[PDB]
Amino acid sequence: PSGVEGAAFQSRLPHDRMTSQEAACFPDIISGPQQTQKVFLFIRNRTLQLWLDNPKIQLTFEATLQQLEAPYNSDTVLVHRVHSYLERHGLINFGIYKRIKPLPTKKTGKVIIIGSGVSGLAAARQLQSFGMDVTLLEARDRVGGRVATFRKGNYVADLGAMVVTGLGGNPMAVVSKQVNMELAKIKQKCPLYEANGQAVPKEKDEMVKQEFNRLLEATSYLSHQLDFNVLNNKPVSLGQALEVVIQLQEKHVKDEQIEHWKKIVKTQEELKELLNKMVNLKEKIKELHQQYKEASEVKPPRDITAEFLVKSKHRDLTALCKEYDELAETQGKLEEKLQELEANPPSDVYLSSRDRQILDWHFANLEFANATPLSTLSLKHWDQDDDFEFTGSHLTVRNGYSCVPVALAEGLDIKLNTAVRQVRYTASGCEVIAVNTRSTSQTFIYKCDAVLCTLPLGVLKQQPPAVQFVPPLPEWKTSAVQRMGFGNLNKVVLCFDRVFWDPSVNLFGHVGSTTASRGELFLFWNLYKAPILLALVAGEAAGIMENISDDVIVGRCLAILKGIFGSSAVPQPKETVVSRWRADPWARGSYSYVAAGSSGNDYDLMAQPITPGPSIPGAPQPIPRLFFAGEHTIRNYPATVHGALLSGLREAGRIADQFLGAMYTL
Amino acid sequence: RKPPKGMFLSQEDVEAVSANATAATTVLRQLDMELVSVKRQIQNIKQTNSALKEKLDGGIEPYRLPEVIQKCNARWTTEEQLLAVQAIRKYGRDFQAISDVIGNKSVVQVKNFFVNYRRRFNIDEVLQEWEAEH
Numbered sequence: 075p076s077g078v079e080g081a082a083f084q085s086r087l088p089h090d091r092m093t094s095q096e097a098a099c100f101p102d103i104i105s106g107p108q109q110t111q112k113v114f115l116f117i118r119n120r121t122l123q124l125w126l127d128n129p130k131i132q133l134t135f136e137a138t139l140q141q142l143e144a145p146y147n148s149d150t151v152l153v154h155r156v157h158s159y160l161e162r163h164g165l166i167n168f169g170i171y172k173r174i175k176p177l178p179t180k181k182t183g184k185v186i187i188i189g190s191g192v193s194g195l196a197a198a199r200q201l202q203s204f205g206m207d208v209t210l211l212e213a214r215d216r217v218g219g220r221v222a223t224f225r226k227g228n229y230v231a232d233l234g235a236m237v238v239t240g241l242g243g244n245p246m247a248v249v250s251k252q253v254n255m256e257l258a259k260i261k262q263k264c265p266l267y268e269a270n271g272q273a274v275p276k277e278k279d280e281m282v283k284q285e286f287n288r289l290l291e292a293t294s295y296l297s298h299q300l301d302f303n304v305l306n307n308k309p310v311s312l313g314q315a316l317e318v319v320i321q322l323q324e325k326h327v328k329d330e331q332i333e334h335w336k337k338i339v340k341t342q343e344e345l346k347e348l349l350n351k352m353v354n355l356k357e358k359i360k361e362l363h364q365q366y367k368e369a370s371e372v373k374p375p376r377d378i379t380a381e382f383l384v385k386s387k388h389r390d391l392t393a394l395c396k397e398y399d400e401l402a403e404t405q406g407k408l409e410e411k412l413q414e415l416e417a418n419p420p421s422d423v424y425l426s427s428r429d430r431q432i433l434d435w436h437f438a439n440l441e442f443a444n445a446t447p448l449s450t451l452s453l454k455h456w457d458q459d460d461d462f463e464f465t466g467s468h469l470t471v472r473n474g475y476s477c478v479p480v481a482l483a484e485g486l487d488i489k490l491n492t493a494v495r496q497v498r499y500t501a502s503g504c505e506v507i508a509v510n511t512r513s514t515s516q517t518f519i520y521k522c523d524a525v526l527c528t529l530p531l532g533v534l535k536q537q538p539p540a541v542q543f544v545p546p547l548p549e550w551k552t553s554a555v556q557r558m559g560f561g562n563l564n565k566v567v568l569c570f571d572r573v574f575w576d577p578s579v580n581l582f583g584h585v586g587s588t589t590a591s592r593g594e595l596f597l598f599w600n601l602y603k604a605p606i607l608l609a610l611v612a613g614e615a616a617g618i619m620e621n622i623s624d625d626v627i628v629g630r631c632l633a634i635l636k637g638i639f640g641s642s643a644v645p646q647p648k649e650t651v652v653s654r655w656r657a658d659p660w661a662r663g664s665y666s667y668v669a670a671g672s673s674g675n676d677y678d679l680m681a682q683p684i685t686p687g688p689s690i691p692g693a694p695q696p697i698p699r700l701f702f703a704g705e706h707t708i709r710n711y712p713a714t715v716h717g718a719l720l721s722g723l724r725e726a727g728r729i730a731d732q733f734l735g736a737m738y739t740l
Numbered sequence: 741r742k743p744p745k746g747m748f749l750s751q752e753d754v755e756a757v758s759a760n761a762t763a764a765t766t767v768l769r770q771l772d773m774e775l776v777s778v779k780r781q782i783q784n785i786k787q788t789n790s791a792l793k794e795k796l797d798g799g800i801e802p803y804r805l806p807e808v809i810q811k812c813n814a815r816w817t818t819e820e821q822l823l824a825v826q827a828i829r830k831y832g833r834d835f836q837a838i839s840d841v842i843g844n845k846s847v848v849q850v851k852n853f854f855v856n857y858r859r860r861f862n863i864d865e866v867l868q869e870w871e872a873e874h
């Protein structure tokens with residue numbers, strides 16, 4: 075993408091069309107004439123471009139209007155409205171930028187933000203950037219939350235987020251310029267090593283791989299074309315739909331074998347009737363030759379009737395020898411037509427037991443990506459966010475992702491080791507009751523105009539609840555919390571004294587023995603400068619490996635690596651770390667998924683803020699007090715950092731519109 | 741529109757594999773047995789036809805007559821006239837068979853024979869004796 079249009083695309087906006095949000099703030103324009111709209115669109119696109127080309131410094135209205143050309147720079151309320159709108163909703167001046175105009179002397183409004191995850195930190199910075207009193211409460215002793223990074227000596231390995239999923243349209247692209255990010259690409263080639271410890275041959279790989287992707291497309295066909303999305307009143311999961319597709323392939327394999335052999339028999343049984351006909355003609359011939367012999371034994375001279383008999387029987391015999399020669403013609407055709415059919419047997423099997431285990435690895439990878447067993451993913455919706463996928467190679471943070479949330483936290487009032495125990499919200503305001511994690515009796519109360527809740531979905535799910543809402547969260551919100559999926563996946567960090575793996579290879583697989591254990595240590599990354607092998611636990615396995623000691627788990631990692639690289643090429647590991655994200659109480663799992671019977675629409679429910687009832691009855695409708703952000707709130711970018719980050723930006727803009735008013739509407 | 745190429749999934753088939761808990765393993769076991777039934781049924785006819793093949797051993801070589809290679813003549817020797825009548829009696833109208841018997845008469849010469857001699861050898865009467873012998 076080139077020019078102003080590239081900035082629109084890079085900001086996740088269509089260059090040639092006004093968005094639903096823009097229509098809300100600029101209804102005069104979009105209801106108005108086509109000309110004015112193109113002006114708007116250009117101004118917006120240009121103002122973005124400017125920010126993007128240098129995102130380490132605030133872009134002011136002046137600076138913007140400066141660079142604008144006529145006719146566009148004529149109308150300055152239009153250019154002011156646009157710059158204000160963008161600035162508000164975090165499309166420009168977000169992250170870590172140098173302010174030209176140091177912060178307003180005094181603040182307007184007080185907001186408590188629960189949790190200093192990337193959602194929280196992003197929102198906070200925006201609200202403080204808008205001059206509000208912002209204080210974050212974190213139960214942990216560190217920022218970032220599900221952006222963890224293990225550091226020790228020169229070893230650095232992310233236990234939480236690790237990958238920037240393309241820069242094309244990604245707002246982490248902007249933050250990656252604002253903070254130094256050693257962004258190393260990922261060469262995707264991943265060789266697989268069965269339980270024996272010997273690579274699947276190239277040929278094999280590609281059958282199973284292609285068959286895998288063919289099987290997925292198949293499930294989509296079931297979902298959309300055959301509308302196979304309910305079964306017994308339960309929603310269909312992706313897992314089910316794969317079994318069904320696989321069975322239908324195994325069925326088809328047999329169906330064909332049956333009709334191939336059932337063709338052989340129909341030919342074989344034509345030949346049976348032909349051989350009978352031929353054996354009975356050989357009989358009449360044998361007898362009839364004897365007769366013609368006997369007729370020629372009669373020595374001449376002979377009368378004409380006995381002459382006629384020889385001639386007669388001679389004709390009658392060559393007549394029957396014609397037939398039999400024309401049946402041995404037919405016999406030869408049908409006899410080879412069997413060597414034809416019995417040389418072209420259709421496939422013996424759909425998938426052998428060896429291939430079926432490799433396919434299980436390709437499924438474990440999918441279970442790793444979606445952080446959940448495939449039996450849980452909605453068939454109709456698991457991939458709904460696939461359109462908003464970014465462009466470009468995926469990348470790692472080589473210096474450790476925690477560098478980002480740390481960088482965001484600078485200049486923010488953050489109360490670490492502070493576990494929110496209860497959230498009270500009323501017509502007049504909110505009070506948040508927290509405690510000190512260390513001495514749990516030591517209590518805190520926080521008054522504020524508004525609460526922003528970035529509590530992870532796993533926490534929101536806890537029963538009995540870790541946080542109490544007063545009044546309780548309404549039926550519609552608590553249902554959407556049940557419905558949505560919170561997944562899990564763990565990482566094992568292996569630190570060595572020396573590289574014993576192919577260092578031109580980033581990642582390589584291990585194929586499990588069973589279906590049951592397809593996720594157990596199924597994948598390893600070498601992505602770091604140092605000698606670190608990162609080992610992944612996905613699917614059903616992840617949840618069970620949390621009940622096994624680190625030593626045991628490290629055991630099974632080495633065992634595998636011996637198999638692949640040799641039983642004395644693999645030292646002991648100097649340093650080892652093992653995640654248990656589902657056990658961790660400030661997460662209760664890894665990230666969301668679209669569970670069967672959920673949809674994208676639940677993610678929008680999760681974002682919908684709550685308005686309390688009126689204090690005095692029959693008094694007017696209050697303001698919305700309790701707001702929600704986090705990875706689980708953004709329909710189009712769930713379970714990501716950029717998602718969280720964007721959710722934070724979003725709620726900040728909304729809260730600011732509420733308590734500071736919106737001068738940009740007109 | 742259509743599934744991936746080589747993947748098979750009829751509406752009808754999906755319903756049939758999902759209709760209960762083990763409609764999957766049922767339908768696939770019917771086919772495992774359907775196959776073994778057709779598999780042995782093959783070896784039955786393979787064995788059966790293997791015997792009928794051996795009964796045709798030798799072919800029909802000891803029963804084959806050498807070549808009569810003679811030139812179709814015009815005249816009807818009284819010999820040939822008599823061979824004809826008797827042939828008509830046995831064969832009726834199979835002019836080809838009658839031609840083959842006599843040995844030196846084209847198949848038209850035979851038809852041509854019927855019409856002119858018909859009066860003198862009562863050929864009508866002869867084929868009444870045929871058809872009655874069938």
Ligand SMILES: Cc1cc2nc3c(=O)[nH]c(=O)nc-3n(C[C@H](O)[C@H](O)[C@H](O)COP(=O)(O)OP(=O)(O)OC[C@H]3O[C@@H](n4cnc5c(N)ncnc54)[C@H](O)[C@@H]3O)c2cc1C
Pocket residue numbers: 188189190191192193194211212213214217218219220221233234235236237238239492493494495528529530533540541563564565655659660661663664665703704705706713714715716718
């Ligand atoms: C293993 C793993 C790998 C991942 N990999 C990637 C990746 O490669 N790429 C990518 O784009 N994304 C990835 N993600 C997703 C990403 O880490 C998260 O989606 C994102 O950081 C979430 O931010 P959040 O603010 O919504 O929640 P969080 O980051 O959890 O922040 C919320 C905060 O609330 C705090 N909190 C919890 N309970 C309380 C309480 N009672 N009182 C006060 N505070 C509380 C938490 O401690 C936390 O700091 C990954 C996640 C995991 C688990």
